[PDB]
Design a binder for this molecule. Structure first.
Ligand SMILES: NC(=O)c1ccc[n+]([C@@H]2O[C@H](COP(=O)([O-])OP(=O)(O)OC[C@H]3O[C@@H](n4cnc5c(N)ncnc54)[C@H](O)[C@@H]3O)[C@@H](O)[C@H]2O)c1
Ligand SMILES: NC(=O)c1ccc[n+]([C@@H]2O[C@H](COP(=O)([O-])OP(=O)(O)OC[C@H]3O[C@@H](n4cnc5c(N)ncnc54)[C@H](O)[C@@H]3O)[C@@H](O)[C@H]2O)c1
Ligand SMILES: NC(=O)c1ccc[n+]([C@@H]2O[C@H](COP(=O)([O-])OP(=O)(O)OC[C@H]3O[C@@H](n4cnc5c(N)ncnc54)[C@H](O)[C@@H]3O)[C@@H](O)[C@H]2O)c1
Ligand SMILES: NC(=O)c1ccc[n+]([C@@H]2O[C@H](COP(=O)([O-])OP(=O)(O)OC[C@H]3O[C@@H](n4cnc5c(N)ncnc54)[C@H](O)[C@@H]3O)[C@@H](O)[C@H]2O)c1
Ligand SMILES: CNC(=O)CN1CCN(C(=O)C[C@H]2CC[C@@H](NC(=O)Cc3sc4ccccc4c3C)CC2)[C@@H](Cc2ccccc2)C1=O
Ligand SMILES: CNC(=O)CN1CCN(C(=O)C[C@H]2CC[C@@H](NC(=O)Cc3sc4ccccc4c3C)CC2)[C@@H](Cc2ccccc2)C1=O
Lengths: 260, 263, 253, 267
């Protein structure tokens, strides 16, 4: 008997087998969930990756910047799961920020066109996905999105931090709408996951930043392992956190609760 | 079950309306083997679906705390350890919460309230961590004290202290591969809460506590049922399980999402 | 002998005499500051409003969505204050969110083009203004922006709440850059000020929660708070938020 | 023509000229405030220290654990400032946690009697002082207490962190009461300042606690976008005076961070 036995769950965001969404999908299938997967742009490449999951699952195209894909999504999901069936879970594991808004580029040098594209994909799309899928979600259902704690500024993350701050606010509003359907909406704020290319300076800054989690975390933090993050997402998709919504669960080894 | 084969200590049962009674019931339904602590309680624990040894524990008693691990080992058998610990203990004299002005609470009463409600979370962890397995979990009960509110007064201060204690307990528990977290629940109609709504503290506090309570279901996007402790007991069992393995020194809100909404 | 004696301060965001920026400008002039004002679109109309201030101040055009206005801003400010002089303070009091993402319109019905415009003007522009003006700011200087506490969701504010959450994050990054110039960056989170039914109930719960009360018709306590941050009296506060809300955010009920 | 011209302000917590309260008192006097000072236990020693301030000020005894000192406080202050006059400001700059509740001693080994004494002095006393002084405070008045950000756990501060978490909660309740008098109540969360206790902890008086607190200080100046000078209490004293002034009239039950902005940055 699995944690998600009989649940129908949509999982977005698989691009490689290192994607957090790949591990979420794997754990959900191990726990008896029946999945529907969504992918962006390189669909034939994504299918070769989803072939590595323990079970078969239909793969649907979804570019969150495409209004036609969003308008047809519910109909395409209904065709995949069968008429009369609805989703119990939705996973948003999508993020993007051009190199001008994240990395080595000065914070002030990111043009708004790049920042806006990043915010569209990383934050606004959480509301777009909920709008498209809530009409085909069962009561007791659960929408989960991926977050990286943006309460404090940090080197390199720059405008992606701003996109996460916007995402946390979007999640609180999505919870108000999802509540009308008896559906929960929450984010999982993960520690860094290893999903010299940017030089010596940024490479060192990012290494110190990332090594700080394992030192601060009372139970440690393994950047090579997405499984504890995938398990946390599955806990929110389950019936075991039924009174949590518009909220953030931290799967970061407890690093955010410690100063040093 | 979610907790199949897990050995879990549950404190805080006094009546069958206690949040700890519901936590214990759900944990047994989910396959856990329990050890109960109390400080008349055996007649209540007889109502649980399965038998469980009941040990005496007054958290203000240093002798009870010093002997606790040995008494638990005797109950579960030599060579066996605990996988979970539940702290569901709270107390504040009437001088520190209710109708009494905030400034009129003498320190002796506030201190006793803080000892039982906050310091004892560290005391319980100190006594039980030496007999806990790696991957283990310690969970305590909280009521969001980030903002002041009518009547809760010094109990709000005790919860603010408890949240801080939890972050330090996580540092110690980490050495054993054990997590420590609090569940911040919405209001639940336990014995005291039903008496206050019933008018035991008068018309003024009765009305203030009723507005405090009604605003909760209004703010919660999924609603809030103060008569039902099951969503809170399920949340505690989620933290006792292997499904939140990277969460520690933290707070999970089982409040219908009320704390995320202004209006 | 005022709080801001001799300080050169830029103030954006005046449109009417009920604008929070109008009250900030008035209090700053009363406290001895020499101002430079910026306005958007209706400059002749804005000019007539700024004549109501106690002292004369040059008015410059600034549409924060206009890259040419931003590129020329420092030069235009230098012409207004004189060569060799720099700013000690910058006030960002700008916000906008198209009707689809604010009010009665469902949260899900706001198209991204409207949300993006709102975020550009309300949040990204705080970084744009700091980028343009930090090269003409003196050490010990202060950048202040206006915020409305977005830590919890609420009725009607909808996508403007999302823009404020983005603004708070932008402020923390602007502080990292401003620090290089010995300049502070902070936001003032104000209670509601008079500048449908749900907006009235939301706005009114504020005076109820506030331990010192809240007067939505009076912008002076907010203007005084902004001037406190522009002064030399909060020299160790940056990337932060000061709440001028009657203490409403500290109380549940 | 000072920021606090004509204001009558009570300042507690002076023990040495390194005390944050000494710098608060100095800046307040430079800004035209008329002070009343309170001292604990070593009053002859405290009088020699307060002699170093730019202006004379009456020194009153106040042990916050002493109910008789608290009951007589308002009358003693009234006698010092003159009948018919009231206070405009109150500064709480008091803290203590017995040795077992800090540094080298394991967090689990601090007995409750020590923790309770520490909480009494460091948190409950903020309510005690407000209870005693609000009846002799003018509208527009301000109560300010000193805090050290306890939102996250950290090495060595141990039970003193717990006392600060309790203090932040007490401040929110004090604001509800102070509001009835038209009085504000707020805390200033300061960055680390090399006072006598701070220098001793870094000095190893355990080695491990000294090493961790050295790391805490280094990181603070690193994280702070405007930097942090632990040898300079003046920015902290200025922030307290800003709250005592008429320039933050709509802020109450709140926390102002005078920490160089370090709490707003991860790295
Ligand atoms: N990796 C970490 O350290 C970390 C930490 C915390 C949170 N997260 C978050 O987890 C999520 C997944 O990131 P990841 O680390 O697995 O990286 P990833 O590159 O594997 O996943 C990002 C996904 O976004 C998809 N995407 C981009 N543009 C899209 C569009 N227009 N339409 C639809 N999908 C689009 C990509 O195709 C990809 O599958 C993101 O939200 C990320 O911010 C990551
Ligand atoms: N609305 C609510 O009921 C509510 C909301 C959120 C959290 N909580 C928390 O949940 C926990 C349980 O409260 P409850 O509502 O079930 O009430 P309860 O009265 O049933 O439980 C409190 C328990 O504390 C025990 N206790 C008191 N002093 C003790 C001592 N010296 N030693 C050992 N145990 C002692 C009592 O015996 C009792 O079992 C508390 O921490 C409470 O603050 C309750
Ligand atoms: N009024 C309140 O209740 C309240 C509460 C908290 C914070 N605030 C904030 O204070 C600020 C000022 O708002 P207000 O209430 O004074 O209203 P306002 O309408 O008087 O001012 C908003 C200003 O933004 C300007 N603006 C719009 N588009 C612009 C553009 N492209 N370029 C430059 N400027 C542009 C407008 O011209 C106007 O001057 C905003 O950031 C607002 O969110 C207001
Ligand atoms: N030093 C720092 O790094 C730092 C940082 C942030 C906040 N603070 C806070 O500032 C405040 C002042 O501390 P400090 O660093 O200036 O140290 P300090 O030792 O100079 O001041 C502490 C004061 O508390 C007094 N006190 C102790 N027990 C008392 C009692 N029973 N009754 C009355 N007064 C009593 C002492 O006499 C002393 O004057 C404390 O609340 C402290 O926690 C200090
Ligand atoms: C058709 N409208 C237009 O042509 C342009 N226009 C003008 C006003 N407008 C704005 O963007 C105004 C702008 C909002 C942000 C900022 N003001 C605030 O932050 C103050 C608010 S507005 C609001 C609304 C609901 C709840 C709280 C608050 C609070 C605290 C500056 C002024 C928007 C949204 C709008 C539409 C109709 C009625 C009211 C608003 C807009 O579309
Ligand atoms: C032998 N000493 C005694 O009997 C009495 N005594 C005096 C000083 N004492 C206090 O409680 C001093 C008090 C602490 C709280 C407060 N100071 C601070 O909060 C400043 C600190 S101390 C510290 C330690 C670690 C991390 C941060 C900080 C910060 C920010 C006022 C002064 C304690 C603990 C102590 C002992 C020796 C050296 C240093 C401390 C104490 O036991």
């Amino acid at each position: 008997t699995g944690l998600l036995d009989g649940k129908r769950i949509l999982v977005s965001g698989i691009i490689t087998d290192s994607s957090i969404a790949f591990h979420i999908a794997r754990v959900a299938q191990e726990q008896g969930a029946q999945l529907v997967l969504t992918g962006f742009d390189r669909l034939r490449l994504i299918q070769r990756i989803t072939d590595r999951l323990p079970a078969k699952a239909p793969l649907l195209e979804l570019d969150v910047q495409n209004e036609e894909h969003l308008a047809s999504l519910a109909g395409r999901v209904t065709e995949a799961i069968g008429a009369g069936n609805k989703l119990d879970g939705v996973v948003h594991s999508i993020g993007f920020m051009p190199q001008t808004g994240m990395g080595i580029n000065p914070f002030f040098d990111a043009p708004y066109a790049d920042v806006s594209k990043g915010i569209h994909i990383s934050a606004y799309s959480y509301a777009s996905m909920a709008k498209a899928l809530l009409p085909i979600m069962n009561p007791g259902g659960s929408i989960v999105g991926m977050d990286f704690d943006p309460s404090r500024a940090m080197p390199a993350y720059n405008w992606m931090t701003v996109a996460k701050s916007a995402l946390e606010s979007v999640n609180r509003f999505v919870a108000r709408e999802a509540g009308k359907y008896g559906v929960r909406s929450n984010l999982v704020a993960a520690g860094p996951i290893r999903t010299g290319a940017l030089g010596e300076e940024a490479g060192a800054q990012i290494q110190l930043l990332e090594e700080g989690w394992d030192q601060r975390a009372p139970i440690g933090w393994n950047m090579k392992d997405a499984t504890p993050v995938a398990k946390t997402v599955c806990a929110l998709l389950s019936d075991w956190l039924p009174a949590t919504t518009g909220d953030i669960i931290y799967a970061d080894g407890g690093a955010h609760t410690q100063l040093l």
